[PDB]
Amino acid sequence: MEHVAFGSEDIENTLAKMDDGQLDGLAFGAIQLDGDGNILQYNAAEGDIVGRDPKQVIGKNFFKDVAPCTDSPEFYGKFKEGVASGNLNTMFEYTFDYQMTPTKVKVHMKKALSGDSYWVFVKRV
Ligand SMILES: *C(=O)/C=C/c1ccc(O)cc1
């Protein structure tokens, strides 16, 4: 398992060294988005929580296509504000309930090392 805790202070730096297999080794879900919400990376742990296939979702828009229950001021809105300002580092609880059993999660949004991509981390609560 990669030795990385959810919510760790320099998580985006730690994840900059990981290849695809490495990200799939994390204890929590990890999604990397561009500024419009297109999915760049999507690990095996995330796909297991929500019943999604990483290969089907990479390249799709998270808010439009994949996760319409997040297309709202309370999720998409927080993301878009972080993109616009360059400041993204926030945690919250949410319920994922589209094409899956309703599941309460802890979400951590954080700007990536590069300043044009953005992480969405997910664990069960
Ligand atoms: C609401 O529609 C949530 C859906 C969703 C959340 C997270 C994912 O990785 C995939 C779909």
The amino acid present at 39, given as its one-letter code, is I
Give, using CA atoms, the residue closest to atom 11 of ligand 1: 67
Q: Resolution limit in angstroms?
A: 1.1
Q: Ligand 1: which of 98, 100, 104 to mutate, most ligand atoms within 8 Å of CB?
A: 98
Could you tell me the residue ranges of all domains in the chain? 1-125
**What is the CA angle 69-93-57, rounded to 5?**
40
Would you say the CB of residue 120 lies under 6 angstroms from ligand 1?
Answer: no
Q: Which numbered atom of ligand 1 lies nearest the CA of 46? A: 9
Multiple choice CATH, 1-125, 3.30.450.20, 3.40.1710.10, 2.60.40.1930, 3.40.50.920: 3.30.450.20
Long-range pairs for 50-59: beta carbons < 8 A, 24 or more residues apart: 50/96, 50/100, 50/103, 51/99, 51/100
Output the CA–CA distances (angstroms, integers) from residue 123 to 37, 113, 115, in the order listed. Answer: 20, 21, 24
